[PDB]
Short mmCIF file of C-alpha atoms in Angstrom, two decimals:
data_model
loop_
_atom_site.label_atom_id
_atom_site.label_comp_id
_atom_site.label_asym_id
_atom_site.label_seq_id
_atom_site.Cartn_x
_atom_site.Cartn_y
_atom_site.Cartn_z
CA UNK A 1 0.54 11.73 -18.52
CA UNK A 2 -3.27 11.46 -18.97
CA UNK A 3 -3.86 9.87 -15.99
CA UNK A 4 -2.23 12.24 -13.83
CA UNK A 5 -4.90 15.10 -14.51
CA UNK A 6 -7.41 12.59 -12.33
CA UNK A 7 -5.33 13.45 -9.41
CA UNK A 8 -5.21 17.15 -8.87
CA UNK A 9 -7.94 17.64 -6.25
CA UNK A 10 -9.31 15.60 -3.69
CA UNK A 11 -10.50 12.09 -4.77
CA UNK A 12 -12.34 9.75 -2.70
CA UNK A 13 -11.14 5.96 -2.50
CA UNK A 14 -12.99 2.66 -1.66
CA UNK A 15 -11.01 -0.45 -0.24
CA UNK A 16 -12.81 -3.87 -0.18
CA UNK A 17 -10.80 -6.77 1.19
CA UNK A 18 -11.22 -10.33 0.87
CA UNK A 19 -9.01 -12.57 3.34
CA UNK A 20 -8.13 -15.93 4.30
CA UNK A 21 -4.91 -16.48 7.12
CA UNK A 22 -4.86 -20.00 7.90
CA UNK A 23 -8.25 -20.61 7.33
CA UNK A 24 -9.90 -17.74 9.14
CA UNK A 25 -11.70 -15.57 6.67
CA UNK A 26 -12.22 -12.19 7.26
CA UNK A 27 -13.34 -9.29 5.38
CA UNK A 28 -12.00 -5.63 5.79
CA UNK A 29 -14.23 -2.37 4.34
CA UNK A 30 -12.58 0.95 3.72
CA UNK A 31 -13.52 4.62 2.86
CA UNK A 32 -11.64 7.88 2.96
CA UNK A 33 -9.51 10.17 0.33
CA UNK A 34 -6.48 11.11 -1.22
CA UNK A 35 -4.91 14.10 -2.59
CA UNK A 36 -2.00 13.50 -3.91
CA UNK A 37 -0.62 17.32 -4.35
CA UNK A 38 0.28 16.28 -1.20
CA UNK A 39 0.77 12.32 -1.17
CA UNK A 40 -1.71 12.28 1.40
CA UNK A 41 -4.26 9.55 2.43
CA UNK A 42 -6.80 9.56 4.81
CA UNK A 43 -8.28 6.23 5.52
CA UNK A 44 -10.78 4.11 7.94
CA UNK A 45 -10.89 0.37 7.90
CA UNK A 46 -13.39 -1.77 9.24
CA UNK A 47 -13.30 -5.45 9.85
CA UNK A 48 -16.78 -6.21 8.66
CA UNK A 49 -16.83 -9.93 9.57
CA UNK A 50 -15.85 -9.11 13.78
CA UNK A 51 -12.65 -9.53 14.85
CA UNK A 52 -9.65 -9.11 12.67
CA UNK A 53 -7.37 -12.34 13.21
CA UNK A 54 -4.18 -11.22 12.45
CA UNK A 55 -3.00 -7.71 13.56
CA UNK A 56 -3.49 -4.45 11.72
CA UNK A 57 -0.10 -3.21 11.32
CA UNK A 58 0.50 -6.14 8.88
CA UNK A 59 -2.44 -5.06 6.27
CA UNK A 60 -1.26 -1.25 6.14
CA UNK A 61 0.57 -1.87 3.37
CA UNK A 62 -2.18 -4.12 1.24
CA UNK A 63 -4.82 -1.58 2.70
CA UNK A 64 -2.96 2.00 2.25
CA UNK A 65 -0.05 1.12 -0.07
CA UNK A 66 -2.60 -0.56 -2.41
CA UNK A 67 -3.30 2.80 -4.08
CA UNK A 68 -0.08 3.94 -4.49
CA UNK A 69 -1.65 6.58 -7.24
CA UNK A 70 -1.83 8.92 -3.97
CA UNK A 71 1.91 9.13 -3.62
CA UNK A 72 3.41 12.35 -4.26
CA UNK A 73 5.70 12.79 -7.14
CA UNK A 74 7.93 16.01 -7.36
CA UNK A 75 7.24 18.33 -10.12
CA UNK A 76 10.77 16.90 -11.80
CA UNK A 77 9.76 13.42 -11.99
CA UNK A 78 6.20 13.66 -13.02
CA UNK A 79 7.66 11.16 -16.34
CA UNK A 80 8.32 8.69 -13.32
CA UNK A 81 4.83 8.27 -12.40
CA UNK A 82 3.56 4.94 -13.51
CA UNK A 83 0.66 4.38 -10.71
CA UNK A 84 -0.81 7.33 -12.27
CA UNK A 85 -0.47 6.73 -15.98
CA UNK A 86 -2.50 3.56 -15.82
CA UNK A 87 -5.55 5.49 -14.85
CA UNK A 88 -8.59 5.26 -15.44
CA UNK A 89 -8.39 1.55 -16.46
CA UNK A 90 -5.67 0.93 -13.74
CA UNK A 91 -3.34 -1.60 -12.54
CA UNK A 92 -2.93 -5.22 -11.52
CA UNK A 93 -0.88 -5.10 -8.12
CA UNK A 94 0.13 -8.22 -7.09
CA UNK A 95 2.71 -8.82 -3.54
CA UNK A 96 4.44 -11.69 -1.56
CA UNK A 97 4.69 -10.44 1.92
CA UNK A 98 7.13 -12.68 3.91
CA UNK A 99 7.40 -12.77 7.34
CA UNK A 100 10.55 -13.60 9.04
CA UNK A 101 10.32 -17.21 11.09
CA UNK A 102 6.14 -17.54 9.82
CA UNK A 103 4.29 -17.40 7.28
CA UNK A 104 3.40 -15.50 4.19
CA UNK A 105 0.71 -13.18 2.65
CA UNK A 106 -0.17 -13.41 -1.08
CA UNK A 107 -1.84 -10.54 -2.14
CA UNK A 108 -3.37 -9.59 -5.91
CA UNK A 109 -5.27 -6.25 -5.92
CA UNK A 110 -7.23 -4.56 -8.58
CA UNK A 111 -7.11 -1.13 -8.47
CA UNK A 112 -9.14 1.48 -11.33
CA UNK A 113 -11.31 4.10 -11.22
CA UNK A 114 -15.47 3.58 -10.76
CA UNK A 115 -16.66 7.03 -11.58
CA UNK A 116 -14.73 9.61 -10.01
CA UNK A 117 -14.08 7.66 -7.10
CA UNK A 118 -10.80 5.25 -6.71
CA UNK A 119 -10.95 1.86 -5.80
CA UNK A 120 -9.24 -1.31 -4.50
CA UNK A 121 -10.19 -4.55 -4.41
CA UNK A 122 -8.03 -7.08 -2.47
CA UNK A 123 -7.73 -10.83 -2.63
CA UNK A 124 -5.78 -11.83 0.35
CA UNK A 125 -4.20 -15.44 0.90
CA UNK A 126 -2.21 -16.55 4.59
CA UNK A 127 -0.41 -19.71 4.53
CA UNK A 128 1.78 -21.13 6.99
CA UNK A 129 1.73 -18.88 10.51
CA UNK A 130 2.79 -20.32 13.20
CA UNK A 131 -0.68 -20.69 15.96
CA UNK A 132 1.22 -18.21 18.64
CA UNK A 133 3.74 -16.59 16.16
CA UNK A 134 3.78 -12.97 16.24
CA UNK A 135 0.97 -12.59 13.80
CA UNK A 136 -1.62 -14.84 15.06
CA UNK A 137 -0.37 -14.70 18.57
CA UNK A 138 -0.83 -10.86 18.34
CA UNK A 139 1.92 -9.56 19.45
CA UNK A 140 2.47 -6.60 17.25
CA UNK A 141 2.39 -3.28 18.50
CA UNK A 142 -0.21 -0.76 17.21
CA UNK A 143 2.23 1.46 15.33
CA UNK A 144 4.14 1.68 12.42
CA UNK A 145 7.61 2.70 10.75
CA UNK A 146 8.37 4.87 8.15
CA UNK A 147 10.19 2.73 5.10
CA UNK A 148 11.22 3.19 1.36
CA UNK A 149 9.48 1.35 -1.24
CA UNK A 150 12.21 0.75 -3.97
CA UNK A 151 10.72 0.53 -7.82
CA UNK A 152 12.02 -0.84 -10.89
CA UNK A 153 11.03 -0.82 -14.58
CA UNK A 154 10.00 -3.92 -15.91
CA UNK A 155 9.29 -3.23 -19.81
CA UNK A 156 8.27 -7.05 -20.48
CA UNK A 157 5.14 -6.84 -18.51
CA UNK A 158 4.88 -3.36 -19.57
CA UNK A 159 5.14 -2.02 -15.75
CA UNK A 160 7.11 -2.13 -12.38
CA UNK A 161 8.13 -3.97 -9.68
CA UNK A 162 8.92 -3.59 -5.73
CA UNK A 163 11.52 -4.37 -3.49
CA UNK A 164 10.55 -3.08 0.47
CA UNK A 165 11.29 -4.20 4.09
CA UNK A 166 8.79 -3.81 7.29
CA UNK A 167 9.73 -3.75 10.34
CA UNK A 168 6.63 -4.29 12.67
CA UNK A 169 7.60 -3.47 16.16
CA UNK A 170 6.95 -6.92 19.08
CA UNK A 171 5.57 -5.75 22.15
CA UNK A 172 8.87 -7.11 24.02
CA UNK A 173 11.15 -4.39 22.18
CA UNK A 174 11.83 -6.89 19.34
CA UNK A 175 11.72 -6.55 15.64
CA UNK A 176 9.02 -8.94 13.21
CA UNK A 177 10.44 -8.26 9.66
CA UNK A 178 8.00 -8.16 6.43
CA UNK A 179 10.08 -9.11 3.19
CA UNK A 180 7.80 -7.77 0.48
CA UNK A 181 8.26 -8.16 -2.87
CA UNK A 182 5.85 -6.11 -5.57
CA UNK A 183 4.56 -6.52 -9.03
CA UNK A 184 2.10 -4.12 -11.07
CA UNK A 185 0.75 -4.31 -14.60
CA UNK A 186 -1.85 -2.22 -16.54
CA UNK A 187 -5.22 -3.29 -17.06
CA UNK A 188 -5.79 -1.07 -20.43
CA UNK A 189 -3.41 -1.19 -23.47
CA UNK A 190 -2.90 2.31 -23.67
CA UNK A 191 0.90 3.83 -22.82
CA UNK A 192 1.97 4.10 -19.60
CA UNK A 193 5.36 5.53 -17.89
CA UNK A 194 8.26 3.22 -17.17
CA UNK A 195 10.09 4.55 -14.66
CA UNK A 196 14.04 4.78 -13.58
CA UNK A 197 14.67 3.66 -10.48
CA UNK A 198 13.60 5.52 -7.45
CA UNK A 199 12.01 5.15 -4.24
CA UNK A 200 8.50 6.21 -2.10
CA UNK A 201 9.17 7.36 1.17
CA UNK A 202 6.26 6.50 3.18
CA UNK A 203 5.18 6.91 6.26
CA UNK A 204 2.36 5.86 8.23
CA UNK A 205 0.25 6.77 11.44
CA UNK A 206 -2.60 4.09 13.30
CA UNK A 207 -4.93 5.23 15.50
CA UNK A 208 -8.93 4.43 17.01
CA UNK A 209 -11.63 6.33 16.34
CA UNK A 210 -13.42 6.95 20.18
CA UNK A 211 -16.68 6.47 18.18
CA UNK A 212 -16.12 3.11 17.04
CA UNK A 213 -17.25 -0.27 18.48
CA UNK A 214 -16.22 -2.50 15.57
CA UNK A 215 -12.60 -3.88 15.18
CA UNK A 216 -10.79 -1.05 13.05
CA UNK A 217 -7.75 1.28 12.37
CA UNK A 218 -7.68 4.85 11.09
CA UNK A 219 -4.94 5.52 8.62
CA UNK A 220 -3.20 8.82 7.84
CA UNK A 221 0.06 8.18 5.41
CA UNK A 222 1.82 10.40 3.66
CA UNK A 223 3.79 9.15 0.44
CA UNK A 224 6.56 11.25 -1.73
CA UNK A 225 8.88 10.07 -4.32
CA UNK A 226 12.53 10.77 -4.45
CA UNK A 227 15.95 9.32 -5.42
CA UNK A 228 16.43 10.78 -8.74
CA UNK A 229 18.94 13.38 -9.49
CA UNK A 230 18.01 16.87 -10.18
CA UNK A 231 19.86 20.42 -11.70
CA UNK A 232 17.61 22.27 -9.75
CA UNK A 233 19.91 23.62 -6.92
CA UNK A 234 21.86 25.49 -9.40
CA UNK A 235 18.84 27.83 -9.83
CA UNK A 236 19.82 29.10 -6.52
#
């Protein structure tokens, strides 16, 4: 596509976050960059209003897998690339993040291009989380799992959907499962690529900058696409 050539080099990205879990509000600032030749992203989030209330593991994926442009997609499905087709205008990414036994995150993210430099802006809404549940009780560990986000084509709305599960490790060896479920639409009306089904493998890596006094959480993930079928083993 068009939108692709935007991505060939190094391109720095922006994340401003607007949040509200049970009625704490909170406000998260980000800055780094991606390069997508190799579906990397390098990012630093700040939680501009003091303390975060809920833990970081469970933004990662509004935070990081809100610019999904960054992922890596194999030379032989380039025409599978919608998050970069919508570009410059961009995309509408909207998710229901479900977690097992509490409550639930509604997310709805614009994400385009200002300048040369990438942005997303979240709206974040928490609802019904249990006071000493494994999200406001924090007791998630500060690490992460590598998981597959499945798309789908949906040619009504003119763009794609999905379908993921995160598993957010308790600090007593147990499991806190994130059902999320994914929409995205353009914002222009120019022609983007519908996909066939396939699949993001993703995987991210939290840690602390030494430097840093404010609540935060550097982000390194590294995104590639697979699951479609290929005759390129017969070249060899």
């Amino acid at each position: 596509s068009k939108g692709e050539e935007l991505f060939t080099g190094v391109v720095p990205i922006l994340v401003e976050l607007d949040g509200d879990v049970n009625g704490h509000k909170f406000s998260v600032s980000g800055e780094g960059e991606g390069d997508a030749t190799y579906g990397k992203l390098t990012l630093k989030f700040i939680c501009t209003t003091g303390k975060l209330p809920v833990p970081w593991p469970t933004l990662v994926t509004t935070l990081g897998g809100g610019v999904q442009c960054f992922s890596r997609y194999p030379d032989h499905m380039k025409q599978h690339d919608f998050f970069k087709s919508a570009m410059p205008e961009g995309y509408v990414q909207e998710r229901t993040i479900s977690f097992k036994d509490d409550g639930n995150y509604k997310t709805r993210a614009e994400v385009k291009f200002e300048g040369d430099t990438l942005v997303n802006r979240i709206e974040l809404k928490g609802i019904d989380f249990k006071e000493d549940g494994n999200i406001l009780g924090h007791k998630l560990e500060y690490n992460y799992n590598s998981h597959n986000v499945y798309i789908t084509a949906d040619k009504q709305k003119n763009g794609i959907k999905a379908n993921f599960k995160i598993r957010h490790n308790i600090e007593d060896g147990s499991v806190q499962l994130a059902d999320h479920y994914q929409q995205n639409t353009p914002i222009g009306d120019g022609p983007v690529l519908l996909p066939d089904n396939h699949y993001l493998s993703t995987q991210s890596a939290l840690s602390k900058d030494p430097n840093e006094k404010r609540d935060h959480m550097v982000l390194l993930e590294f995104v590639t696409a697979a699951g479609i079928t290929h005759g390129m083993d017969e070249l060899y």
